[PDB]
Amino acid sequence: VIVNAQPKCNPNLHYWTTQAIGLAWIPYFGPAAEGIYTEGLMHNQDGLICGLRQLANETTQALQLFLRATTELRTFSILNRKAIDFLLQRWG
Amino acid sequence: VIVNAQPKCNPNLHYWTTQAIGLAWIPYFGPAAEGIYTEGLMHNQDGLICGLRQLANETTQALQLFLRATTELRTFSILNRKAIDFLLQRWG
Amino acid sequence: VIVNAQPKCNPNLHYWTTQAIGLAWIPYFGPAAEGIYTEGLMHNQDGLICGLRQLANETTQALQLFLRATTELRTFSILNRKAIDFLLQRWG
Amino acid sequence: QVQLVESGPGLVKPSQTLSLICTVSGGSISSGDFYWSWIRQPPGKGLEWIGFFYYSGITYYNPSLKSRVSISRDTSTNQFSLKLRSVTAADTAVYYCARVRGGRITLGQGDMYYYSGMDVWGQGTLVTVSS
Amino acid sequence: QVQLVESGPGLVKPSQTLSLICTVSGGSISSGDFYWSWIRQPPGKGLEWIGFFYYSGITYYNPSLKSRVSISRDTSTNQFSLKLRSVTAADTAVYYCARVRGGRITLGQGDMYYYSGMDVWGQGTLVTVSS
Amino acid sequence: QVQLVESGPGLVKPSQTLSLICTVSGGSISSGDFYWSWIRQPPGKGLEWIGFFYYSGITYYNPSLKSRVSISRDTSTNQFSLKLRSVTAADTAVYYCARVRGGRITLGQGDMYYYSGMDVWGQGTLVTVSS
Amino acid sequence: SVLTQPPSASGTPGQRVSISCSGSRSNIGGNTVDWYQQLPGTDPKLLIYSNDQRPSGVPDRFSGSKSGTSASLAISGLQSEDEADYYCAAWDDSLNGHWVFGGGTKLTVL
Amino acid sequence: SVLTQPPSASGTPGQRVSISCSGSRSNIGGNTVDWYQQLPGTDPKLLIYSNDQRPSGVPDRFSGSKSGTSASLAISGLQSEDEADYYCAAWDDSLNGHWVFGGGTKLTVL
Amino acid sequence: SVLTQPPSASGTPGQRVSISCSGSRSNIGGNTVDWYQQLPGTDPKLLIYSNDQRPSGVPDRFSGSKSGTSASLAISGLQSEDEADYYCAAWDDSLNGHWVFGGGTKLTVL
Amino acid sequence: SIPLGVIHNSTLQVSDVDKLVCRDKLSSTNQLRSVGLNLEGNGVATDVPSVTKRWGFRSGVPPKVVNYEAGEWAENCYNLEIKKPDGSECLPAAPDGIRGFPRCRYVHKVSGTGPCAGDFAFHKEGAFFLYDRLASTVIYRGTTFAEGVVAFLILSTTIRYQATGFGTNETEYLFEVDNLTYVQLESRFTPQFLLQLNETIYASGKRSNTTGKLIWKVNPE
Amino acid sequence: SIPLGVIHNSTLQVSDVDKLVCRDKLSSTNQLRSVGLNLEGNGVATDVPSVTKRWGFRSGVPPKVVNYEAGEWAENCYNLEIKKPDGSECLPAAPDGIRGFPRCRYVHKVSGTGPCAGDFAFHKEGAFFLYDRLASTVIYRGTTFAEGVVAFLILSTTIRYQATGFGTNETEYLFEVDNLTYVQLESRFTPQFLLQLNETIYASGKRSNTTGKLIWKVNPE
Amino acid sequence: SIPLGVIHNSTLQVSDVDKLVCRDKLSSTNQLRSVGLNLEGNGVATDVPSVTKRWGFRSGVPPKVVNYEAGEWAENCYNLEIKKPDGSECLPAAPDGIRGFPRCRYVHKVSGTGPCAGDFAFHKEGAFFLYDRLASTVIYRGTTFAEGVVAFLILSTTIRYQATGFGTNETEYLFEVDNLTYVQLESRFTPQFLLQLNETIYASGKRSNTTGKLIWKVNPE
Ligand SMILES: *[C@@H]1O[C@H](CO)[C@@H](O[C@@H]2O[C@H](CO)[C@@H](O[C@@H]3O[C@H](CO[C@H]4O[C@H](CO)[C@@H](O)[C@H](O)[C@@H]4O)[C@@H](O)[C@H](O[C@H]4O[C@H](CO)[C@@H](O)[C@H](O)[C@@H]4O)[C@@H]3O)[C@H](O)[C@H]2NC(C)=O)[C@H](O)[C@H]1NC(C)=O
Ligand SMILES: *[C@@H]1O[C@H](CO)[C@@H](O[C@@H]2O[C@H](CO)[C@@H](O[C@@H]3O[C@H](CO[C@H]4O[C@H](CO)[C@@H](O)[C@H](O)[C@@H]4O)[C@@H](O)[C@H](O[C@H]4O[C@H](CO)[C@@H](O)[C@H](O)[C@@H]4O)[C@@H]3O)[C@H](O)[C@H]2NC(C)=O)[C@H](O)[C@H]1NC(C)=O
Ligand SMILES: *[C@@H]1O[C@H](CO)[C@@H](O[C@@H]2O[C@H](CO)[C@@H](O[C@@H]3O[C@H](CO[C@H]4O[C@H](CO)[C@@H](O)[C@H](O)[C@@H]4O)[C@@H](O)[C@H](O[C@H]4O[C@H](CO)[C@@H](O)[C@H](O)[C@@H]4O)[C@@H]3O)[C@H](O)[C@H]2NC(C)=O)[C@H](O)[C@H]1NC(C)=O
Ligand SMILES: *[C@@H]1O[C@H](CO)[C@@H](O)[C@H](O)[C@H]1NC(C)=O
Ligand SMILES: *[C@@H]1O[C@H](CO)[C@@H](O)[C@H](O)[C@H]1NC(C)=O
Ligand SMILES: *[C@@H]1O[C@H](CO)[C@@H](O)[C@H](O)[C@H]1NC(C)=O
Ligand SMILES: *[C@@H]1O[C@H](CO)[C@@H](O)[C@H](O)[C@H]1NC(C)=O
Ligand SMILES: *[C@@H]1O[C@H](CO)[C@@H](O)[C@H](O)[C@H]1NC(C)=O
Ligand SMILES: *[C@@H]1O[C@H](CO)[C@@H](O)[C@H](O)[C@H]1NC(C)=O
Ligand SMILES: *[C@@H]1O[C@H](CO)[C@@H](O)[C@H](O)[C@H]1NC(C)=O
Ligand SMILES: *[C@@H]1O[C@H](CO)[C@@H](O)[C@H](O)[C@H]1NC(C)=O
Ligand SMILES: *[C@@H]1O[C@H](CO)[C@@H](O)[C@H](O)[C@H]1NC(C)=O
């Protein structure tokens, strides 16, 4: 599994995210971008928060090398590539 | 189904689209961009044209909110995402 | 199959590509971009090198027309589209 | 360039018709593409329009005078005149003949109008209404 | 604006206590938010600080003189003075009274210090130590 | 800097060989890295080249004179001369000695050539061909 | 004197000043508004036409505008020669082509 | 006189003028073209070399070009001192290194 | 004379010159460093404070810096009136608030 | 969360995402489309003052775009050059990747001024500005665009106008015939009717006879 | 080669790529996430001199970015305006698509100078600079960013500081209270402790009484 | 409509799209490639005048790019700095994302002028200009690029030249040895042969002895 084997870890998370109907859905009447975020708090139930920290720590190395090797300055394709490989491995 | 429940609807469509071999396929000899379009007309057979108008009217709201929540200034990924979900729902 | 039916063909290839762990993985300490390439040589075993040349010659025409018809100035989606069609044709 | 020069009795008696004539020279207000008008300025007052006439026979009048004013012209003399019936003390004013810019008037098929307005003034003739 | 003027015997005998007094006017070094100091400059030498005094009673002294120097003031006369016991030949110098910029001194709750430093000099009084 | 000065008989008889000599000073056309030439300008005419000589022994001649002209030099006197056999009336001209820019000439392994061309003129000597 | 104008306006030489005009949709909110400048002792001259166009001979300090049923004249630095009775005018559609002038504003140079 | 040159050229002082030159691939279309300026009564001086380079002493008004088997001299504002016989020249390869001059153009300042 | 200063400095009028200062973390590497200018025959004046701030009356040619336990005074074009004994100073924390001056540098204008 | 329609043997159906429809077949991505539609196709008014009133300014809201494969021809397409009252630009010139809408019978180009308090003019109903092949949430300067919407499925002259009060409720527009010839713009005039006014004036020759421009009233008759 | 984690009934598991895990179900792309994490969440120091030392300059290495769907709030977020010793800019202003990090209690804005030999400041440990929703390999000028990392899964005030020696090992920072009022910055002072120093000085009124700025030592006690 | 090739047990086969080939397996996207090939690999001439003649100007045709994972080394790669006859630039400087082709033995850099009537120089045969990892339909200024094509599959010195008539049929080029030393460029001279001419002249020292540049004929022998 994923283990955060380092001296410190924050056991909580304070979230922000971009994750009703009306004029608010029209850019003209809706809020400025700083207001389109939602939030909340979560506890480190089952060690999930610290494990996430290690995942990000492992990811950083793979990701920096990945980005180094590409031509795309702005890459938002990683999750889509994963979805494609997910199916190809079973139905290739 | 999709119903265009509003006071007016144009029952036809006059189309343009970017949908032989020779030097024309070489940018150097080929036409300027205003000339790469093809066209045609279609009738509202079976109510399809008006239904399309409503689809676009429903889409607008979902789309404006979608775009609001992203980081991509130029998003051409919507149809690709749909193709991926199409298969994942049956073969996830 | 793919046949390079033209007067000349180079029967070899001298490759470059962007295809260990340490500080080298950190952009701050790692090499400049001219140094991130690897290389090697290959022979035209079974006619593969010349066939590749023809593939690129056929591709050029399809590709120039394809690019002409799109809005994306920087298109890196071709291989992803192929992967999607690959699965859709069998599991559509 | 075009002169519009007022002439009249100066002194007009109460109740008669006041008749002022403008003599035109240097162009032809009475027959070319012009509107012209009469305007008056009572001493101490602003500008009060009396009426318009377009050379072909189109007229407009101040509502207070629609029952009292008549404007006409003679294209053979290039003169035009203002007639105000029942002149009274309240009509003492400097009367002016005036030109509406010519060549600035569009009259069309029906649903069309002009783009005209005033430029050239005459000198002004004071009319005193008294016994 | 504030004057700081040195006065003393000029000639002081070896082993006695040297006592120099500064008279202050144009402001109040002795009672306002100031540090002041004594500095000396032996002929041919640089500037050697003798000691500081903050009007409320805060002092600092040159380590070589910590056992020899005492600085005090009288807020009723707006005068202050320097006392150096056992004056010797090595102490011949021009002695100066000096002002530390006032209103530049923060003394806080404990873990706080000032932002002060020197600006105004007195004239300097030469003290000769001899028999 | 380098002078190239023509000298000759002035009057030459029809059918003899015309011989003009250039005396060179201020440098050495005859032995340094130079081409030099003879050029003539018949009165009323343009410039007609006669021939070239590169100090090491390389020559070129006007096709019309290839059978008639010989150019040679003496490196011991730094003089060079032009010989035209069978001089005729058509050869009356001002004859000039001239320098091809030196140090501008590349002669290589075979498939190489120069980058040279002319700069310095002599004064010109008129040669009259007559009885 | 249908179009309301202030009875007066003023400012010092070099001062930016303006004169308002107010009517209805039959006149100002109908047609364009012209302005005239009447120097003391003489007839008014066309000063502004078609809301903001200058007649030849009218200096650049004169400008103006039209909005709704309101209109305005402005002088971008008042001169002593500008002491005058200023008038606004337009065609009145409700009276079928009646020419309307405003009250007239007395502009005083200080 | 192998390279064709116009017999004359002209213009007023300050006028931009030019002189053409025309040969073959053995000369102009072979080698570079130099130009010379012969003032009346004297020998020609190198004016232009290597198509467009100026010899020291030649003013900035002198320029030129080479294209194909044609060449040109130009003066960017003609001076009275420029009245002259102008000549174009190059090595002729077909004659194995023959020096060729053009006919010579008489440039008249008006 | 705790903070090391060169015994002298020099340059011609108009020359850019500088005077160094060196101590420890208890003084220069502790607090800020002020500089004083002592013209011959008189008391020193505050010249620079808080490393690079000028007292009113001090000209723009005077500047300075602090880094680590070192400090410097600079004159952006030396004037003849700048012949002076220059001093650096700061509070010495290890001695609990001892005022420290450097040795003093004699700047000579040439 | 974006709806999609599908073409069935019957009509245009809603593509559901909760029910997996096993009769919906997608063998290739070449069956996917993005089509641009105009608002005029649903009866939305196109006369200039009735159009500009639907647009307005905001800031703090960044622009976004999406593309098209195909779309509707516009009868009425717009091109703005509006400056602030102080002469500065209201909108930035369109960025790289933007070209004008490909097909239109009449382009309504407006030159004028008005308040422009935001960064961009946004559509008040949320409709998109349609460029050559890209839809945008904002209007870009100097570029011809149509006003409309986008649907996702699985299978020429220019009239110039002048303007004032561009960003206000109380505004005014003129139809341009010539440099000194204008008529008041009125909502009862279709592009053809306006051109008929141009034919009448241009041909009669009764155009401004002064140095400035004159504006014709057009009689309501 | 990029690892991914998955949420299991137990804990966060490694998503393998060599073993095809048939118990891992993905019915839609709406189960995919990119989450931003801060380095302070693993105990990394946030005091300004302890932060800037982790950043430094390089050239020949172009920048890259990736995005986020969600992320952590920062307690400490940074904003730099650093010039070279000659007054030129160290870093380019952030490009289009970059906006500041969306949520933070304290922003540490630093105005100052120092050597900047490269094109960009890169993180020395390879961490990313986090902007509104984009992670970047470089620091952009004038923009607020958090320092952190990204994980992929399948399911407010500002304190200004002055600086010198920005690009050196031997550096100095000041905490700003007022235009002429500074205190030396020390690592034992948390944002709250620094603000308490601002309250003490501001309130006592004992601020610079000269034309230039004065710097307070803060006694170690 | 773009063809793809596949690697079979035999040879490189055409990937069909009408016949679903059930023997073609794709377990991951890591089996997909984009490879750049040079035109010289098919015998296309590389001598400068024989290269520039294949390029030319057009407008109204926007540029497009695609990328590479890998590609061929170029023996001959080009870099242009061509100005219009009036001194203005023919081509814009390459945009962000463009860097020069990564590997080449000889770069042919040309400094000169000629007519440039379009916006960009396009390849007349439709070949792409190859930059570091991007293929482009156009030539960008100041950037080194190779001339070539792209295939999709499922699994160093610089010589400077001067030029005139860049955009014409009748053109001329020079090989640069020194600032005042040029030789006429001729098609029989390979990069090595040209360098041998540089060795001969440079070493003999017989270089221009005037203020301007001189041009050597090189004897055809
Ligand atoms: C998707 O499909 C729906 C349904 O067809 C469209 O619905 C329209 O939405 C607009 C905007 O909300 C509505 O406009 C409003 O009209 C009110 C007056 O209604 C009468 O008069 C109009 C003509 O002026 C007639 O068309 C209408 O039938 C009525 O007779 C105004 O008072 C409203 O003004 C207020 O809201 C706007 C919001 O933008 C503010 O700017 C104003 O200042 C003010 O506060 C408003 O203008 C329209 O009536 C709806 N039509 C129908 C049939 O329901 C969507 O527009 C469509 N969306 C897209 C992108 O295509
Ligand atoms: C992913 O997770 C790993 C493991 O938790 C993190 O590992 C850290 O990596 C950094 C950088 O390599 C290490 O930093 C080094 O610390 C040395 C001193 O160690 C002692 O002192 C520090 C405090 O100063 C304590 O934190 C530490 O526990 C020790 O007591 C320094 O001497 C090193 O300096 C040299 O390398 C750097 C490299 O950037 C150069 O700039 C210097 O000039 C010099 O050459 C260095 O600073 C750190 O100790 C590691 N921690 C642990 C627990 O192993 C990764 O950083 C993390 N990555 C990301 C992106 O989040
Ligand atoms: C994909 O693969 C094909 C097949 O191998 C390549 O085909 C070549 O295409 C070019 C361009 O159409 C052809 O070039 C033409 O050559 C004519 C002369 O042919 C003789 O001389 C040449 C050398 O000059 C020899 O190579 C050739 O074998 C013959 O002996 C010219 O007259 C043509 O000029 C006209 O068309 C061009 C078009 O660009 C205009 O610019 C000119 O002004 C003029 O109108 C032209 O140059 C070439 O002959 C074809 N080769 C073969 C073997 O068929 C494709 O080029 C290749 N594509 C890519 C992108 O790689
Ligand atoms: C315009 O004025 C000129 C005199 O300058 C006159 O000849 C012409 O007829 C006028 N135009 C019209 C339409 O009346
Ligand atoms: C600052 O100086 C003024 C005199 O100019 C004095 O009145 C004031 O008290 C001083 N400030 C402090 C804090 O001492
Ligand atoms: C160039 O000219 C100089 C005299 O200025 C001469 O000494 C030198 O030898 C010449 N160069 C060659 C190659 O002849
Ligand atoms: C709307 O109209 C009112 C008058 O009824 C006016 O006061 C207001 O300023 C106008 N608003 C805008 C944006 O023009
Ligand atoms: C008016 O009609 C003329 C007819 O020659 C035409 O040239 C002109 O473009 C038209 N003007 C407008 C605004 O359409
Ligand atoms: C690091 O410190 C040393 C002194 O110990 C100094 O010489 C060196 O220049 C410093 N390096 C940097 C980048 O500041
Ligand atoms: C210091 O406290 C005051 C209280 O009024 C506040 O306005 C100011 O912003 C604070 N300064 C800093 C640097 O936080
Ligand atoms: C092509 O050559 C001809 C001469 O044969 C010339 O007239 C024409 O202008 C040239 N075209 C170009 C583009 O250089
Ligand atoms: C010519 O050879 C020299 C040898 O020292 C070299 O430095 C120079 O770069 C070469 N020139 C060219 C154009 O290759």
Numbering used by the authors:
A (entry chain E), B (entry chain D), C (entry chain F): 503 to 521, 526 to 598
D (entry chain G), E (entry chain H), F (entry chain I): 1 to 131
G (entry chain J), H (entry chain L), I (entry chain K): 2 to 111
J (entry chain A), K (entry chain B), L (entry chain C): 32 to 186, 215 to 280
Q: Anything the authors wrote about it?
A:
To determine the structural basis of neutralization and synergy behind glycan cap antibody-based enhancement of base-region-binding antibodies, we solved eight structures of glycan cap antibodies in complex with mucin deleted (ΔMuc) EBOV GP (Makona) and BDBV GPΔMuc. All glycan cap antibodies make contacts exclusively within GP1 and are heavily biased toward heavy-chain (HC) contacts. Antibody contacts are focused on the β17 strand of GP1 from residues 268–280, with the majority of contacts centered around W275, which, when mutated to alanine, abrogates binding. Through molecular mimicry, the CDRH3 or CDRH2 loops of each of the neutralizing glycan cap antibodies characterized in this study bury analogous hydrophobic residues in the cradle, displacing the anchor.
In addition, we also tested two new antibodies, EBOV-293 and EBOV-296, which we isolated from an individual treated for EBOV infection in the United States (STAR Methods). Additionally, most glycan cap antibodies make some contact with the inner head domain. The CDRH3 loops of the glycan cap antibodies generally adopt an extended β-hairpin motif with a partial or full β strand secondary structure. These loops also pair with β17 in GP1 to form an extended β sheet and displace the β18-β18′ hairpin by mimicking its structure, as observed in our previous structure of EBOV-548. Notably, we observed that the MLD cradle forms a hydrophobic pocket on the outside of the GP, which is accessed by side chains of the glycan cap antibody CDRH2 or CDRH3 loops. The antibody EBOV-296 uses M112H3 to access this pocket and produces an intermediate level of trimer instability and synergy. Most of our structures were determined in complex with EBOV-515 to assist with angular sampling and alignment, but we chose not to model EBOV-515 and removed this density from our figures for clarity and to focus on glycan cap antibodies.
